[PDB]
Design a binder for this molecule. Structure first.
Ligand SMILES: COc1cc(CN2C(=O)N(Cc3ccc(O)c(OC)c3)N(C(=O)CCc3ccc(O)cc3)C[C@@H](O)[C@H]2Cc2ccccc2)ccc1O
Lengths: 99, 99
């Protein structure tokens, strides 16, 4: 699909048997979601940007479905104000910027 | 052009007759650049990010070239981690997300 940028590029994602709305963010290196539970082991990580840093839990090899496109990758979980889909997963769904 | 996301989508922009490196960021509503000087009066603006908020200076009708594409719009200046080209200008240069 082709998504314009007149409005925030929000899409529904399916992760851990849960449905959530997330922002397709080309400026984000990693995918970070609001507090939720995920399987497997995790590593603490600190991610920052505008406003400073937040502490998150890093889970690797996590399955996620974005706009029907399945992908696997690292998901950070923490106090983010919005669910973000970063480049680490945008690449897997073949997402590109065009102009 | 078509830009893949295996790496940060950093491009060259020109503003105030100077070249700067910036991030094409679909997750950003606005364009925010690191401290610099711009003409005219400015208005107050707060941008909410991953770690909280920051105060910035808002300048309107500013000429800016993005990857060779000329644009004229609102440019915010403040303590941002990197120069960010947000949706307000991505829409002006006809940029979209595709997959
Ligand atoms: C609302 O308009 C703007 C918001 C931002 C702040 N911002 C953010 O807070 N970040 C932080 C961030 C989040 C996730 C990541 O995986 C990530 O990895 C780099 C960074 N970004 C950025 O700041 C990009 C800059 C950057 C580059 C390298 C680095 O080491 C740290 C930061 C990405 C932006 O898209 C964006 C994502 C976002 C949106 C709403 C609420 C919270 C965050 C900004 C402008 C708006 O108009």
């Amino acid at each position: 699909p082709q998504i314009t940028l007149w409005q925030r590029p929000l899409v529904t994602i399916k992760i851990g048997g849960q449905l959530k709305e997330a922002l397709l963010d080309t400026g984000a290196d990693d995918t970070v979601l609001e507090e939720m539970s995920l399987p497997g082991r995790w590593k603490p990580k600190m991610i920052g940007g505008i406003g400073g840093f937040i502490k998150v839990r890093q889970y690797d090899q996590i399955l996620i479905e974005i706009c029907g496109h399945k992908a696997i990758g690292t998901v950070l979980v923490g106090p983010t104000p919005v669910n973000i889909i970063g480049r680490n997963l945008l690449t897997q769904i073949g997402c590109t910027l065009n102009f």
